[PDB]
Amino acid sequence: TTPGPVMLDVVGTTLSRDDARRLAHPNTGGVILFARHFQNRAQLTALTDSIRAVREDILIAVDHEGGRVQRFRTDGFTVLPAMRRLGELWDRDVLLATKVATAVGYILAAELRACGIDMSFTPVLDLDYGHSKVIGDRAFHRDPRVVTLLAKSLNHGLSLAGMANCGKHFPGHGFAEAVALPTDDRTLDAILEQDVAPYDWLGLSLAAVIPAHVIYTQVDKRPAGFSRVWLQDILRGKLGFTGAIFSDDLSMEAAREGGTLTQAADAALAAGCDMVLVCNQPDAAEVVLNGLKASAESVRRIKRMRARGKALKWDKLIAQPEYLQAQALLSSAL
């Protein structure tokens, strides 16, 4: 089987008959996990194993950013700092900050792969303007050059465990704050010269992208996730990006602008998304699976988000010097 364009979630800590039906649908391509799917490491591994048993080509992801966004914080998972902490460390010691960023990346990816997960929806590349509360301390730094090199060092640590990455929220969620959709009335050039710069500078170190549920009125009235201008003209065209594009959670009502989930899913894919996220309502996601009108190009990019190579099980990772080394550095540096 080949991955479909829909990423959804399962009902709980153990796979159900309804999950198996949904996982087997041709338009299913991924699973995203949340805190309700984690009891302990043993349970989570059995869950991810059973998911791949139903659909061997499935992509399994999770929002593991650190700080305020980390689904798995217990039973050995290292509580990671808010990315804003790394920008603050950068301001005291640039090179040390890049060293810690990689260690955070490797810890993050290694622990996730030990439980059978492919990727995390990280890093946040939004600039820390201080404007967006939903972003807040999830942003690395105000300076796009600092965001680039810190995020790059983190993506390097992810790659050391064979894990990819996903920058967000394109073209930038940091400026709009802004219950309807946020709006950003800056000019295209202003958005390109700063918020978009990390996506451009990261080059091949950027594996994927999530667009923002934000309307940039001076560029396109459609939200970035449903904007062919942003996803094709800018990202694919002007920047030459060839990585995967995941929509932001379509379950966010205001993002759909009066349309159904299925209609919003068709618009996102039509705009340029390779995969769409429908979180926290599997039955509504199943309606999308069966009503979707919309692959060759996308399937290639989706397959390339699978974790590369073999992963260390927990019994092996806990005794690995590199893992132990990263743990110590994180404690001392922060």
Ligand X SMILES: CC(=O)N[C@H]1/C(=N/OC(=O)Nc2ccccc2)O[C@H](CO)[C@@H](O)[C@@H]1O
CB of 48 to ligand X, least distance (A): 17
Element (H, E) at 101: helix 94-113
Residue (202 or 276) nearer to ligand X, CB: 276
Residue (127 or 317) nearer to ligand X, CB: 127
Interface segment toward ligand X; rule CB under 6 A; list 95-103, 217-225, 246-254, 292-300: 246-254
Q: Enumerate the β-bridge partners of residue 48.
A: none
Q: Rule CB under 6 A: say whether 137 interacts with ligand X.
A: no
Enter the DSSP assignment of 26: T
Interface segment toward ligand X; rule CB under 6 A; list 47-55, 153-161, 215-223, 247-255: 247-255
Residue 233, C-beta contacts closer than 8 angstroms, at least 6 positions apart: none
Closest residue by Cα to residue 76 from 123, 118, 38: 38
Annotation-wise, does 138 bind a ligand? yes
Strand-strand pairing, 64-66 and 69-70: antiparallel
Residue (32 or 276) nearer to ligand X, CB: 32
DSSP result, 208-257: EEEE-S-BBTTTBSS-GGG-HIIIIIIIIIIS---SEEBPP-TT-HHHHT
Q: Rule CB under 6 A: say whether 71 interacts with ligand X.
A: no
Residue (63 or 111) nearer to ligand X, CB: 63
Separation of alpha carbons 174 and 87, rounded Å: 15
The residues in 17-46 that bind ligand X, with binding defined as CB under 6 A, are: 32
| 324 alpha carbon, distance to own chain's centre | 26
CB of 333 to ligand X, least distance (A): 25
The residue with tokens 């110590």 is 328
CA dihedral 140, 146, 150, 155 (to 10 degrees): 100
The residue with tokens 């170190």 is 205
Given 141, 173, 256, 301, the residue binding ligand X (CB under 6 A): 173
| 188 alpha carbon, distance to own chain's centre | 24
Residue (34 or 314) nearer to ligand X, CB: 34
Given 277, 278, 305, 307, the residue binding ligand X (CB under 6 A): 277
CB of 132 to ligand X, least distance (A): 8
Q: Rule CB under 6 A: say whether 121 interacts with ligand X.
A: yes
Catalytic residue among 126, 195, 248, 266: 248
Element (H, E) at 147: helix 144-160
Active site includes 248? yes
For residue 88, give both structure tokens. Answer: 């603050």
Given 137, 249, 266, 274, the residue binding ligand X (CB under 6 A): 249
Interface segment toward ligand X; rule CB under 6 A; list 81-89, 249-257, 295-303, 326-334: 249-257
Q: Rule CB under 6 A: say whether 251 interacts with ligand X.
A: yes
CB-CB contact of 307 with 63 (8 Å): no
CB of 174 to ligand X, least distance (A): 11
Q: Enumerate the β-bridge partners of residue 6.
A: 28, 276
Cβ atoms < 10 Å from Cβ of 2? 11
Given 248, 266, 274, 286, the residue binding ligand X (CB under 6 A): 248
CB of 316 to ligand X, least distance (A): 29
CB of 256 to ligand X, least distance (A): 11
For residue 202, give both structure tokens. Answer: 């990261």
For residue 22, give both structure tokens. Answer: 């949904």
Interface segment toward ligand X; rule CB under 6 A; list 76-84, 93-101, 165-173, 307-315: 165-173
Annotation-wise, does 36 bind a ligand? no
Query: Residue positions in the annotated binding site for substrate?
Result: 63, 71, 138, 168-169
Binding site for ligand X (CB under 6 A): 32, 63, 121, 134, 168-169, 173, 210, 248-249, 251-252, 277, 279
Active site residues: 248
